[PDB]
Design a protein around this nucleic acid. Structure first.
Lengths: 186, 106, 183, 125, 168
RNA sequence: UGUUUAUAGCCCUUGUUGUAAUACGUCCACUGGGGACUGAGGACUGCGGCUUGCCAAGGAUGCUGACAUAAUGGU
RNA sequence: CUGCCGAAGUUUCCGGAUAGCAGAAACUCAGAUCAGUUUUAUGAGUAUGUAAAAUGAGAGUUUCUAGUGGGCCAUUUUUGGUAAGCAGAACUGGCGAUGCGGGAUGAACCGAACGUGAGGUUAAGGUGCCGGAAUGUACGCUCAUCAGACGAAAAGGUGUUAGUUCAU
RNA sequence: GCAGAUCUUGGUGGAAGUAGC
RNA sequence: GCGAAACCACAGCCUGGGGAACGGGCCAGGCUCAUACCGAAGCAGAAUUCGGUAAGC
RNA sequence: AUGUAUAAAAAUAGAGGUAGGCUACUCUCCUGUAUCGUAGAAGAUGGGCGAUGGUUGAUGAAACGGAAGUGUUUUAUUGACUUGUCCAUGAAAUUCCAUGAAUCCAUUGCAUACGACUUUA
């Protein structure tokens, strides 16, 4: 449906293949896509299954960061040999965690890629950041530490916004104009 | 603020192509906000344009327009087929478009 | 089966809350926290009855439900009466010296069949190990977690293992003798 | 949980030509299909799949396999109508339905209306 | 969509036999062309009666008398496989006899990778009595306390703003 | 649990209004819109429909503009 | 340079003379004949040939005059085979003179056979992304820690899924 | 009436400012 | 400082598959004796053996 | 460019808000088809009434924001705008779409295919 000039996507609980396919199609549509929390990406299958899949890949440059793992999946779904697919890649920014510039921006999700809406209950799935922890990535511990720090600050902002929202909500019914002409569904 | 925007935003996706053969005479246009072929029937026959700019100025204006008209829907997802007075360049894939509300039947 | 439900009677524990798939069973003996979020079994609380129901499950899901009920029952028993395990040391020529540190949290075994290297075993949290005076060379471990006590006993038995020696000839070692409820 | 597939539960149809209508489960054909009915004349007794409906929180006392006439009498007796409407769910849906019909003039009157309500800002005044 | 067709056929009269025997069959087909062809397969398969020496005298579609009442149907089939000889009996719960056969054709294809041509349904009978049910799932469906959680439905409108509720 | 309309009802059969409704199939020389691509031919002949004339009937004409002194194109 | 016709690649006797295939001319005919046709029935042994109804096309010549006078693959039939494969003939078309859509790609596979174009609709194959097209619907099966997706292979499995049957 | 004939005649290149003297 | 000649369709990274070579052009992609460990074996212990794991040597 | 408008986390197989004193509450979810914003010759000139508030610009600012803080607020004063409710004029014939250091250098050996290298200078 409606689009935006730049899109920030929260990759928590999103399947790797499903999200990458939607992102790759959006990149070829000229949109600018920024994917945050790339280390919480989920892949269907046992963590043993993906460990050997990555270990087989280890046996070019074998990138270990979860963000570069996601970029590899997106890269394969683009015509990177041509200029059109080259420009699409430069319009994508995959990062782990939520950096400050995208910290205070709305983060949308893709229901077609969400694990809960796409994976059978009880199925074993592995987290990309957790999977990448035993392949060479050594920043998982600190990335989590900033994440809780960001969550505390984000929660404090939400309480301030919620407390402020209570003021307009209380004053919403105070004005008689709301009740007088609420026949329009508003 | 609030501009004018008497049109609908749209994107140029690709030409009417098979796997290995392209037909630049017809372009596939995604009118964003339209999600099915039945919804696409409203926008059939409307005037679509590609507004771009060139560094050289003509008559004191640096804006050039290629006019077209939406012909028929394409697929089940509301994408439409548009034919322009000049075939759209291949480099305008993913570029924005403007779908007017005229000619109107509402 | 549309839904397979296993019903258990809530014990006299003060708290039997299982909110957020975490069972914080608190009783007179103490409070024990267990995680059950890894099993797709719905837990319903109604008075003194706790029901684990699996809907449209398979044999593995049904098997996990039975294991979950057994785990919950073991936790309830440990939080109410506790678990006590007694082990008797066996020696043939060189007596084995046992030392308790940090209120029995650390157990040191020395002179095991003439060994000059002392083996140190750290017990699991919530389990206290003491030497019973009723029986010589007897160690009694009491705790609220049956699994922790069993794991500690297995680690102690594995530590006192004869290597490159005949099992039939050399019978010296430490093994669990008896286990049961403290109360 | 709060919602279960049981005889007498009021469900809301969300797919097909009866989208947005209200119905009550009468029989349980299978874990994928169920028989429903409604007191409204335009809604006939039919078998529908659980993918085309969402269960509301309203549960009403029905014998299994009740006919449409008995269901309609029980529906009126148990006062199911305007009880679902009392829920904020129906009010949100009804507001959405009324909003969809709104034409341009009504939209213009709304903008002036919400412009007046906005300037109140009597917070901390 | 399958349709239950009642097909009556007989051989053409000749000097040897003044009046021929009348054979009636009930079988399921999407259109009357398939039903007539399948009916001729069974008679040749059974009575060894040539199609060229016979004719179809009556064809009639049959509708469910009580499509608003849930029932249990017992279905017997014959299987043509690598071995080429098998017979099984299955039970399904639904409201329409045709619906059971469509569901029946689904599971054989899903499990045994069977085809429409191989299966030759001998008989379909409604099993009204609860005791006569030989299948556990139908028996579970016949208890007075039928209430179960929702099976997951895994439902353009891309880029949702908020996390979906995905709950009741 | 067993029970038989009660202090809920359900199933079967006839009756039942009835000549029900609906779905499906099929048909209308029944009708109302929206979109796109083409305008070949060059007096009159013909086949038809209305009422000499008229017409949607042997293939596009009307009404407008702007630019032309750029657009349209070409290389 | 353009346009229009257009093979054969092999019977048979034997480097050949024939023939066949493809054209030219002159003849007589549409009330005459003909057919990689289907029948009917006679017989003969489900087929067989012959004779006489449907369907389609106007047909039959005579004369002389270019080229070919290799095969490959595939289908079916085949006889023996024989580590097993295979080999051997024969039967029939396609390519060989032929581009096009699909098949990742590819000459033998699936569709389709070609003037220059506009519009429409399809075939085969497809609709997550690369890629035009449903991250369609309704059922199920599958968890692999090498699936699947496009011979050790038989079987074994405290491997499942549906289970059936028989015992209690 | 030419693109071919390890074509004929003429001109001219890269190798190369190389091998080298 | 003076100064050639042979040669010259054009080119110039791999990996596979592409049946006829196909790579240089085409299609999809990049640019286990010992011992360490334990297990089993009377292996009395020493002496160790075997079994695997294991490419460190 | 054409509103280049929107910061919880979290489960989902339950969460959040709301409230009482973690135990008992309640309500909402069932997406954003939401919310904010939006009227004027793209937005004129005055008269007002009514807010006497709101919308903001301008500078003078302090606080917060490491991560990639580079932006969130708090404002202080002033400048205007105000369609909040109204009026009086005005904007058109374009009279149907086109819009100063460093290097070289010298020194340098500490170096060794060649520079490089290495201080000094």
């Amino acid at each position: 449906s409606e689009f935006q000039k730049v899109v920030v996507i929260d990759a928590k609980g999103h399947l790797l293949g499903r999200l990458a396919s939607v992102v790759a199609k959006q990149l070829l549509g000229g949109q600018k896509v920024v994917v945050v929390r790339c280390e919480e990406l989920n892949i269907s299958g046992h963590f043993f299954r993906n460990k050997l899949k990555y270990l087989a890949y280890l046996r070019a440059f074998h990138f270990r960061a979860p963000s570069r793992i996601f970029q590899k999946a997106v890269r394969g779904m683009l015509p990177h040999k041509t200029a059109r697919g080259q420009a699409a890649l430069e319009h994508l920014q995959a990062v782990e965690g939520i950096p400050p510039p995208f910290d205070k921006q709305k983060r949308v999700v893709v229901p077609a890629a969400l694990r809960v809406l796409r994976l059978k209950p009880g199925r074993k799935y592995c987290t990309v950041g957790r999977l990448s922890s035993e392949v060479g990535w050594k920043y998982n511990d600190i990335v989590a530490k900033l994440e809780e720090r960001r969550k505390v600050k984000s929660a404090a902002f939400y309480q301030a916004k919620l407390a402020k929202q209570k003021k307009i909500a209380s004053a919403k019914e105070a004005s008689p104009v709301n009740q007088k002409l609420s026949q329009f569904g508003y | 603020a609030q501009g004018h925007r008497l049109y609908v935003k749209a994107k140029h996706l690709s030409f009417q192509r098979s796997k290995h053969v392209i037909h630049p005479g017809t372009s596939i246009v995604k009118i964003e906000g339209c999600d099915s072929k039945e919804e696409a029937q409203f926008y059939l026959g409307k005037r679509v344009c590609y507004v771009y700019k060139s560094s050289k100025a003509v008559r004191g204006s640096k804006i050039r327009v290629i006019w077209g008209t939406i012909a028929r829907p394409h697929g089940n997802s509301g994408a439409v087929r548009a034919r322009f007075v000049h075939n759209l360049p291949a480099k305008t894939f993913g570029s924005s478009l403007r779908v007017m509300l005229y000619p109107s039947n509402i | 089966d549309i839904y397979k439900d296993e019903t258990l009677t809530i014990p006299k524990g003060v708290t039997v809350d299982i909110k957020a798939r975490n069972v914080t069973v608190t009783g007179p003996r103490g409070t024990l926290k267990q995680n059950l979020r890894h099993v797709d079994i719905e837990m319903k609380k109604q008075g003194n009855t706790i029901k684990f129901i699996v809907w449209h499950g398979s044999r593995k899901h049904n098997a996990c439900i039975r294991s979950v009920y057994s785990i919950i029952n073991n936790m309830i028993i440990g939080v109410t009466q506790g678990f006590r395990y007694k082990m008797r040391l066996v020696y043939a020529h060189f007596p084995i010296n046992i030392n308790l540190t940090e209120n029995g949290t650390v157990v040191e075994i020395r002179n095991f069949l003439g060994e000059r290297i002392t083996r140190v075993i750290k017990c699991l949290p919530g389990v206290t190990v003491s030497i019973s005076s009723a029986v010589k060379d007897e160690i009694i471990l009491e705790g609220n977690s049956l699994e922790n006590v069993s794991q500690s006993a297995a680690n102690i038995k594995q530590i006192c293992n004869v290597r490159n020696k005949d099992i039939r000839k050399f019978l010296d070692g430490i093994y669990v003798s008896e286990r049961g409820n403290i109360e | 949980f709060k919602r279960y597939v049981e005889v007498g539960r009021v469900v809301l149809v969300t797919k097909g030509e009866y989208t947005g209508k209200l119905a009550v489960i009468v029989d349980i054909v299978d874990h994928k299909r169920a028989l429903i009915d409604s007191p409204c004349s335009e809604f006939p007794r039919q078998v529908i799949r659980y993918g085309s409906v969402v269960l509301t929180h309203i549960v009403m006392k029905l014998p299994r396999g009740a006919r449409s006439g008995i269901v309609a009498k029980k529906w009126k007796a148990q006062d199911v109508c305007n009880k679902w409407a009392s829920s904020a769910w129906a009010k949100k849906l009804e507001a959405k339905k009324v909003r969809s019909q709104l034409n341009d003039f009504d939209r213009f009157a709304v903008m002036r209306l919400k412009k007046q309500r906005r300037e109140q800002v009597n917070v901390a005044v | 969509a399958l349709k239950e067709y009642q097909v009556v056929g007989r051989k053409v009269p000749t000097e040897h036999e003044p009046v021929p025997k009348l054979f009636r069959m009930r079988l399921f087909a999407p259109n009357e062309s398939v039903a007539k062809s399948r009916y001729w397969y069974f008679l040749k398969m059974i009575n060894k009666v040539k199609k060229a020496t016979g004719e179809i005298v009556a064809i009639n579609e049959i509708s469910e008398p009580k499509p608003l009442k849930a029932k249990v149907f017992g279905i017997w089939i014959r299987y043509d496989s690598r071995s080429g000889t098998h017979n099984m009996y299955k039970e399904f719960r639904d409201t329409t006899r045709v619906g059971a056969v469509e569901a029946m054709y689904a599971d054989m294809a899903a499990r045994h990778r069977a085809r429409f041509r191989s299966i030759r349904i001998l008989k379909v009978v409604e099993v009204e009595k609860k005791e006569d049910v030989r299948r556990n799932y139908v028996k579970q469906l016949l208890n007075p306390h039928l209430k179960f959680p929702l099976p997951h439905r895994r439902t353009k409108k891309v880029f949702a703003p908020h996390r979906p509720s995905t709950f009741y």
